[PDB]
């Protein structure tokens, strides 16, 4: 039974219940993520920015089946075009706006990757992607406002592929944590 998370801590407790089994009800998880009203005081500890690129800040290591982190995007910071390593990926906005651009999986033939669509993800909204849906790029295109997003991945993964927009060629990237549980992890 899905109740509104009152705080980030409450959300985390609810997620441990939603991931107590072996499968994932995506619509339920997205609904409860969207229902949490971002409260900056609750997540300030994890919102550690870097001047030059976006940072990944682990919030909860989950129960073996998921993990929850906060990404901090300076003005103009964005990602590669990337996949999600056969995992579920949820993205909720905590502050600001992000542009999400969708791409199809490339064919083996070298070719420009043409965007299939784009949208602006706004404060408190929760987006979802998986590899069956496609690839995406996420960017803070603002010149004046940093963005903060809450990401849930299930199962957890620490590698993915970046895709070259000119060719569709991919390269494996290992993702690192800027911090864990509020502690900077150089
Ligand atoms: N998957 C990316 C962010 C957009 S989902 C990452 O964890 O670095
Ligand atoms: Fe992503």
Curated annotation (Swiss-Prot):
Entry note: cofactor: Binds 1 Fe cation per subunit. Ni(2+) and Zn(2+) can be used to a lesser extent.
Inducers of expression: By increase of sulfur amino acid intake.
Tissue-level expression: Highest levels in liver. Significant expression also in kidney, lung and brain.
A GO CC term assigned to this protein in UniProt: cytosol
GO biological process: cysteine metabolic process; L-cysteine catabolic process; L-cysteine metabolic process; lactation; response to amino acid; response to azide; response to cAMP; response to ethanol
Disulfide bonds: none
This enzyme's EC code(s): 1.13.11.20
The keyword Metal-binding belongs to this UniProt entry's keyword annotation: yes
Subunit-structure text: Monomer.
Designated name of the protein: Cysteine dioxygenase type 1
Lineage: Eukaryota, Metazoa, Chordata, Craniata, Vertebrata
Gene name as annotated: Cdo1
């Amino acid at each position: 039974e899905l109740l509104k998370p009152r705080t980030l801590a409450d959300l985390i407790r609810i997620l441990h219940e939603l991931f107590a089994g072996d499968e994932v009800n995506v619509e339920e998880v997205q609904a409860v993520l969207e229902a949490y009203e971002s409260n900056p005081a609750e997540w300030a500890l994890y919102a550690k920015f870097d001047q030059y690129r976006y940072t990944r800040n682990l919030v909860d290591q989950g129960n073996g089946k998921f993990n929850l982190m906060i990404l901090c995007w300076g003005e103009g910071h964005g990602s590669s075009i990337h996949d999600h390593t056969d995992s579920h990926a949820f993205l909720k906005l905590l502050q600001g706006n992000l542009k999400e651009t969708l791409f199809d999986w490339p064919d083996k033939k070298s070719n420009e990757m043409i965007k299939k669509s784009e949208r602006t993800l706004r404060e408190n909204q929760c987006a979802y992607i998986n590899d069956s849906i496609g690839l995406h790029r996420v960017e803070n295109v603002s010149h004046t406002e940093p963005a903060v997003s809450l990401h849930l991945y299930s199962p957890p993964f620490d590698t993915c592929h970046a895709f070259d927009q000119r060719t569709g060629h991919k390269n494996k990237v290992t993702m690192t944590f800027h911090s864990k549980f509020g502690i900077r992890t150089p």
